[PDB]
Design a binder for this molecule. Structure first.
Ligand SMILES: Cc1cn([C@H]2C[C@H](OP(=O)(O)O)[C@@H](COP(=O)(O)O)O2)c(=O)[nH]c1=O
Ligand SMILES: [Ca+2]
Length: 129
């Protein structure tokens, strides 16, 4: 896998963000995770976490996996990095997302994210509290 540039257009919620990629606006859905909806418990906190992380970054990058690059709703499916830290991983380390939606062929960072979830669950953080 490889990182490609993008710039933020707008934070949406815990696991969706609007980015400019190859010069075109796209909504990205973070691979391999699930944040609560804004209306559910920990939703606001996930949205805020992601928002802060993407808005404060000097450098946003997109990393597609090996499979499908857009989902059935036209959202890009990627690992998104903010100054080299994976937002997908950071949410999970924080107990603000679960590992979820693990489809064969776009699952490169599964075990990385599961390891983070195990540690969050042991700290009993947020979702795991
Ligand atoms: C994360 C991800 C979600 N999706 C689809 C599955 C779910 O379909 P359904 O809408 O039919 O439940 C939906 C979940 O995304 P959200 O959690 O953003 O709703 O997006 C993919 O198809 N591929 C993916 O990698
Ligand atoms: Ca969600």
């Amino acid at each position: 896998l490889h990182k490609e540039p993008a710039t933020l257009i707008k934070a949406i919620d815990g696991d969706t963000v609007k980015l400019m990629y190859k010069g075109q606006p796209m909504t990205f859905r973070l691979l391999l995770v699930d944040t609560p909806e804004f209306n559910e418990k920990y939703g606001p906190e996930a949205s805020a976490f992601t928002k802060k992380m993407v808005e404060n970054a000097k450098k946003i990058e997109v990393e597609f996996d090996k499979g499908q690059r857009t989902d059935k709703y036209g959202r890009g499916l990627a690992y998104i990095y903010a100054d080299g830290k994976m937002v997908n991983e950071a949410l999970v380390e924080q107990g603000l997302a679960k590992v979820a939606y693990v489809y064969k062929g776009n699952n490169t960072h599964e075990q990385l994210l599961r390891k983070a979830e195990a540690q969050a669950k042991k700290e009993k953080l947020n979702i795991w509290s």
